[PDB]
Write an enzyme that holds these catalytic residues in place. Structure first.
Site, PDB file in Angstrom:
ATOM      1  CE1 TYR A 194      -2.748   0.571   1.280  1.00  0.00           C
ATOM      2  CE2 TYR A 194      -2.093   2.162  -0.450  1.00  0.00           C
ATOM      3  CZ  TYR A 194      -1.757   1.201   0.499  1.00  0.00           C
ATOM      4  OH  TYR A 194      -0.430   0.849   0.645  1.00  0.00           O
TER       5      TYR A 194
ATOM      6  CG  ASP B 111      -8.541  -1.131  -4.975  1.00  0.00           C
ATOM      7  OD1 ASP B 111      -8.324  -2.355  -5.000  1.00  0.00           O
ATOM      8  OD2 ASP B 111      -7.654  -0.356  -4.594  1.00  0.00           O
TER       9      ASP B 111
ATOM     10  NE  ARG C 186       9.393   3.442 -21.709  1.00  0.00           N
ATOM     11  CZ  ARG C 186       9.332   4.111 -22.864  1.00  0.00           C
ATOM     12  NH1 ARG C 186       8.217   4.707 -23.295  1.00  0.00           N
ATOM     13  NH2 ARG C 186      10.444   4.207 -23.578  1.00  0.00           N
TER      14      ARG C 186
ATOM     15  CE  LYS D 276      -1.303  -4.770   0.075  1.00  0.00           C
ATOM     16  NZ  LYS D 276      -2.266  -3.697  -0.198  1.00  0.00           N
TER      17      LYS D 276
END
Lengths: 396, 396, 396, 396
Positions: free
Chosen positions: A112, A184, A59, A209
């Site tokens: 987005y 972004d 983690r 993407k």
């Protein structure tokens, strides 16, 4: 040498990676483990005080995911990287690490949608207020800043009509008033645009993407200075979102990113041909693509981006019914809402994602009834043009 | 039939799973995909209004991870499940979905440390206050409730000394004052303890531990009512943490959980033998294990748990230096901080995880200088006892 | 439509694949299963008589591996495909299916070494005799045929000096005397050479090399007529080698092959630049590459291949000691014996693989003391040239 | 210590495995690589002369698959192991390494069908003759040996009626006449039967069945002396079948085998209960199971096997039509031809696999019209008995 010294294509291949010191394995091994063993009680405390070099639990950190993080730090020219479970988790880990009750954020409106819900509903419920503006007009950004403003947030190019934001100008503004700029860069990848080199402080991507590129991984990455990345890791990830990336997912994205240069060159060559075809077609009213010299911000595009991208939007004659007919008549392009895969994907927001929204509401959100979005893939451009010509003709 | 009708071992095997309708494949296929294709524009809007049955993108939902969620809903006797990137993400997605600025939480003090940081630092920074109490005394829980209290949070058994919390009694209390009760069932698994059957509203687990069982997955699960799970999915996951589970990780945990019944029976048989050995040894001052009739809450344990678990804590004569010597002299047990794997794991918090904390601070946190924690595995119990006897003798 | 109708790049992407009919998943699911369930006793016999369409056990067939087989059948223009555990298994399953005690084979001498051991030792021990010839002289092939000859076997280009074999001419010869021609197309891939279109009956590849392309899969494929492929599957695979491909391995190779066109264009562009650099360098005595107009078979190369490939051999001044020095002084190229990966790989057979063979024996096998072999990758060609120039200069 | 010294359950867990020396990772890493890099030209020749310790290419050897091979060598008490692509490949790599044109094999008649085709058709076509006998009568084995006999081949228990073969007696016989004995131990696993400890020279398994145990891997293993295993690797695998195991497949089978002890105890406890139920049922004419004291070879079973296994055969009243009805009426057991999974599997050879064979031919092959085969899983035995009782009652 130092991977930071080679050419960009050499870095895509080699950076962050080396043969396994123990066996010589050329591929990065998949360390699909939850825990790591100590050789003594003393080594156990050494690592737990972060004094020792090592891993403790996945983690927190893992050799597979460390390779992906170091590669993407090199490509964006940042100090350090941090991998995450999703594109969303990259943006939320970021902004929940930076902000607290009483802080303020200035954000672009054209972003987005899942990001738009986090900012307009979730943040205000924790005491963090957000002002939305049109970021293509840098004066609107300036007029919304307050004494409480910690962060300015932008995407470029922006969906659905591929308008741009002048990164260098916005950075200067935010910094004048003591805020950080967060960009972004999902639509472009570091092959086509480098926001840290223009003044941004932190860059985020959905690797879902283009960076992965193969339609089989959900994931994100954050790149920035080491002192910001350490807090995002040991507080945001560990104590707030818990959004870690699995080691198999990191290995698939290291494998996908090896071809990033050759995939982005072909995506962009195919999209320019298809955008020129659509620009000359009498049943298409508008074509939004940064590579066409009629785009309203063509010259900014030419300074800030090395190529014009693999995404095109366009409007078909006849509104809602014509777009529904066009989508139902393609036989090679696939109907889907993602982008950046090796297959060409098409969608019609008005009849698909935004069917429940009211006409005049979508309209103020840039989405006309005839707007179609196309993610261009790696097929022969002739075949894609032929499938489009056939579906347009029927529709219209 | 309906899987909800078979015996518990039959459910561990079959529930949530069936042969692939398209091919007959017996194993659940790995749907390692980021996106899902529509057959028409109309099907695209149907799904996007949640009216249609289907998938859209994996961050939201996936056939592989849906199988794991439905299995664990059956085993805990809840309506629905939701998978997540980590044990931490299960707890944070939960509490950030329920709470907002101005709300209050009552929590046990004896909980997992990463959970303790989220509650004591991150929550107050978003406007959410937390009171910590000793949950083994149900009156302390009652005395801390306020008009703002939305949630009561407990773990049982609790670390490091395996004290218990009376789930049925605490549920009644929280509900009398209109709060929800949230239980972390990580230590027991649904094979040994069922909190929803005793009155709890929501149960969370790290699957990293026993539910997976094989030391190779980081993950979590949340189980509850359908109307709570829908909000945790479409708001907490989608718009707040972004902590989704990968489909490969869901497939490995479906594979690990097939053996849960036979692994928990052997873990618990081996731990009772080892706890009886340690109870008779003259260099061990104390042994904390729910299966020994000298545990202070033995009878509550006998009503609430079907078996006493695979974890043991114990104190070695001679304090800090003796525990450091014991840990450095085992040759079969491995030094590590996780638990619930097929290998036996050992740790000494005072010289390992908590070396930088001040003696008197650890002490108030239940951790003495001589305390060792043991996660018992699937090896021959004779071999583990022999390795312990040898290391204790040297140390002491 | 029918995938057999689109352009070659469109086929690389789409052929053999479609969205999952049951869920719409865009990526081919990984069917990682050993067995397949029947819905009735009657369906069980239907399939077992091969009358029904379906799967039974993966050793025999699987939906994942069926997609890879159908894709590669399209690309080579053959009727059907069959996947296998290794490049070796593709060649042995083939020739053990065709041949039996008393049969004869005519083979090129200049072939892959593991193939040379199977043919010179294993075959004669089963009653199958082999004659080796120089296949660049089609008259030697003709002079070795016998009444017992079932198969002629060739590779082109051939290692280590990249000489060629005239596929169209050799096919005509074998067929005149009633034999089959079998071509190993590993070095070229179906993007650059198509042996079935020139007259060959069966084509084999190690997918370990360019078809996968990413250095992380061991595998093979055989392509031919349906009636030959059925016997190779139901007898050679099932009852002789047992060399089946795993479904994960088939999925990784489907993922790698998506980029085959764009990888082969860049491999070949980089190798032509590097071969021109080496041709002008005064410390290099010879350069073997099909794209240089001085290659002895340049015009045959220009008719039979669409590009000249990613492999180069070359001889350094100073023999054995100079080649050992050059190899020890590269800092970007990696020392290894494989080829067709995204990283540039280098090897020196005389001091590496063939150190135990006697000088005059290697010599008759085409391998001089100064011969180096280079597999050109996807890095910047400038960086590779600079690393070579630096290592040559030191060596010499 | 040395793993060869611990108890059997401790070995199942630990043998062949250790933490990664480089990172401390507890899980064996997945080395999913095709090639391995050398640090100098000299290290390259060292390894290629097999003088150096190391890896070269995965077809030959890999760190992941080396762990599985060393584990299974320990469990069967042999010197060395070799992994393979399938159960078939384990048997063929074995016998093609040992035998050549003019040799002879003596084999049991009651063996796996794919093995029966290799021996009766493929071997004679390479010059290797085979005699089939009833191996439950050791005198028939003795009477078929010839001066050319290299190998005796047996399975025990044997399908479809679970008859036994006296391993210790057959070994003595073969060795008296200078042959090797090869035993297929697939049905029992090394937890229940150890053929090398009774005199066998080589043991083979399909790991597809109990050693993996989870229905998601096709694979095999061969265990024997180091000098036989070296030839099977460097000649049989490398130059004859090419049947190597992938590293992912080796990692899944290492993960499955961790639970072998606890799975075999539960399989065998459930099968004894179900076999006692069937023995008392008035519509069942016969029950074949080694644990019932009426089995014709009960006492041999009690000496040679530690438990009686998870497989049962049985005959239903009413022949072909009754067995077809029973199979079509189960609702928990699944119709399939494999065995050794965590789910209970059922099949009816006469109406399923052997429907095209002539009644009187199957009959001589031990298969009556009413014979059903059951692979008992890990579900509650009550639930399986209830599903059987319901389907028998309907059928009959």
């Amino acid at each position: 040498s130092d991977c930071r010294t080679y050419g960009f294509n050499t870095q895509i291949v080699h950076a962050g990676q080396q043969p396994d010191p123990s066996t010589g394995a050329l591929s990065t091994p998949i360390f699909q483990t939850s825990t790591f063993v100590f050789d003594s009680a003393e080594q156990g405390a050494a690592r737990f005080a972060l004094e020792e070099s090592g891993y403790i639990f996945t983690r927190l950190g893992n050799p597979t995911t460390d390779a992906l993080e170091k590669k993407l730090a090199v490509l964006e020219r940042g100090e350090a990287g941090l991998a995450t479970a999703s594109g969303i988790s990259a943006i939320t880990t970021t902004l929940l690490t930076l902000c607290q009750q009483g802080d303020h954020i200035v954000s672009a409106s054209a972003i987005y949608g899942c990001t738009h819900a986090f900012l307009s509903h979730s943040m205000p419920k924790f005491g963090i207020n957000v002002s939305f503006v049109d970021a293509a007009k840098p004066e609107e950004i300036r007029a919304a800043m307050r004494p409480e403003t910690k962060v300015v947030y932008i995407e470029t190019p922006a969906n659905p009509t591929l308008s741009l934001v002048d990164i260098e100008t916005v950075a200067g503004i935010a910094h004048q008033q003591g805020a950080l700029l967060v960009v972004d860069n999902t639509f472009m990848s570091p092959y086509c645009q480098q926001p840290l080199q223009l003044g941004a402080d932190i860059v985020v991507h959905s690797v879902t993407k283009y960076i992965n590129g193969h339609g089989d991984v959900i994931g994100g990455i954050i790149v920035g200075k080491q002192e910001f990345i350490d807090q995002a890791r040991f507080v945001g990830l560990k104590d707030i979102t818990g959004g870690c990336m699995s080691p198999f997912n990191a290995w698939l994205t290291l494998r996908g990113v090896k071809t990033l240069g050759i995939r982005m060159e072909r995506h962009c060559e195919n999209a320019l041909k298809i955008a020129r075809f659509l620009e000359g077609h009498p049943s298409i009213t508008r074509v939004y693509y940064p590579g066409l010299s009629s785009h309203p911000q063509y010259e900014l595009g030419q300074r800030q981006m090395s190529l014009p991208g693999g995404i095109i939007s366009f409007e078909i004659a006849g509104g809602l019914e014509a777009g529904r007919r066009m989508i139902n008549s393609v036989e090679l392009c696939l109907l889907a809402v993602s982008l950046g895969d090796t297959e060409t994907l098409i969608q019609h927001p008005a009849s698909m994602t935004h069917s429940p929204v009211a006409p005049e509401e979508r309209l103020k959100a840039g989405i006309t009834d005839g707007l179609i979005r196309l993610s261009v893939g790696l097929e022969d451009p002739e075949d894609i043009i032929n499938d489009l010509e056939h579906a347009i003709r029927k529709a219209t």
